[PDB]
Design a protein around this ligand. Sequence first.
Ligand SMILES: CCCCCCCCCCCCCCCCOC(=O)CCCCCCC
Ligand SMILES: CCCCCCCCCCCCCCCCOC(=O)CCCCCCC
Lengths: 194, 194
Amino acid sequence: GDDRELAILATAENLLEDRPLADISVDDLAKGAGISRPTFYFYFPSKEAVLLTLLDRVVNQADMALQTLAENPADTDRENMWRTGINVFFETFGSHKAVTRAGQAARATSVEVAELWSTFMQKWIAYTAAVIDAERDRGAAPRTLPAHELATALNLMNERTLFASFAGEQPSVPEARVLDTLVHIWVTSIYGEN
Amino acid sequence: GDDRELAILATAENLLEDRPLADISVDDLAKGAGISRPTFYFYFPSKEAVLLTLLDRVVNQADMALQTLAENPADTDRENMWRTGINVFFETFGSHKAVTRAGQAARATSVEVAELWSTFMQKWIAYTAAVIDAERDRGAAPRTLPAHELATALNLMNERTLFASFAGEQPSVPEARVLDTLVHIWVTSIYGEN
Ligand SMILES: CCCCCCCCCCCCCCCCOC(=O)CCCCCCC
Ligand SMILES: CCCCCCCCCCCCCCCCOC(=O)CCCCCCC
């Protein structure tokens, strides 16, 4: 039943491009997937469950991509190392704006969404801290702020800043400038002595 | 009618300390202020309007405080200059956690709240950019990223990071460490050459 489940997912991601989940019905998702309404309930308990699955797929895709970089570094300087890591998130979520927006708006009423985001953020923060620590160990970065607290703030900045740019918020950094903006902040705060 | 209006405001801020606005009724606010329910509607059209006023008071208090610092600098180094500026927000909103939380949760359904926050953020971003520019003009800070884009990201980081700390989110920087964390990121990214 992958086809019909994927068809429900694709339909949902497509519609979420024009309106919020609240304005999307199970029938819409059903008609979109070419199945009946009761048959939808065979794959998902609710439309909120569909969005959750969508976010879970986007989140894991970014995580897997980062995992790929971890295993296969890249012959380049330290500035580029961080840029490639940040780019994983700019590109993954930037290629799924509708789901990112819907996912954010869902956090307020979905503990599933909240816990999913929280778990990976902790995961991405722990990795950033490990890289910073490794960087400090080799003598490249000065031992300034506690690595994990620095990593948390930088990660929270990206979460908020990338979202603002993807959503075209007021205020926000233009999407065409956001990667460079974040990379500079990460690089100066990680290697800066003061 | 200041007394009764202020009594409605105080009552609301007090209750918001234990539960969300949704779990607070106009009667609660009414009983809390020692007036009847219909008399409440004499000062505010709704409870959502009360929270808006509360946020507006907290936002302006921070703005006025920053304005005071602008007019009356402080004989100290550049690192301390930024710390005092950031402290205005850490202290003002940190002394009104309930209203800050409620205010954030209200943004999703209140354009009044959204526009209020947006207007001052733009204002605080413009000021940060002016200081950065002044700093660059005098030769203290290197001309790296466009000042306004750097200012936007730093401000968005504070908004997200301070909120996470005040709310005790997972993940978050402990409140007792957040000021230092942010000041370091601001200082290194503003004066850092690379
Ligand atoms: C070697 C280099 C390492 C680089 C690590 C980079 C890690 C940064 C991870 C944080 C950024 C995540 C991108 C988020 C974009 C918009 O996020 C939305 O918020 C998603 C919706 C989820 C709901 C939760 C809302 C608080
Ligand atoms: C000379 C030094 C200048 C320093 C300037 C510092 C400016 C930083 C201003 C941004 C931080 C604001 C603090 C926010 C704390 C939590 O915010 C909540 O979000 C409030 C609720 C409002 C709802 C909107 C949610 C996006």
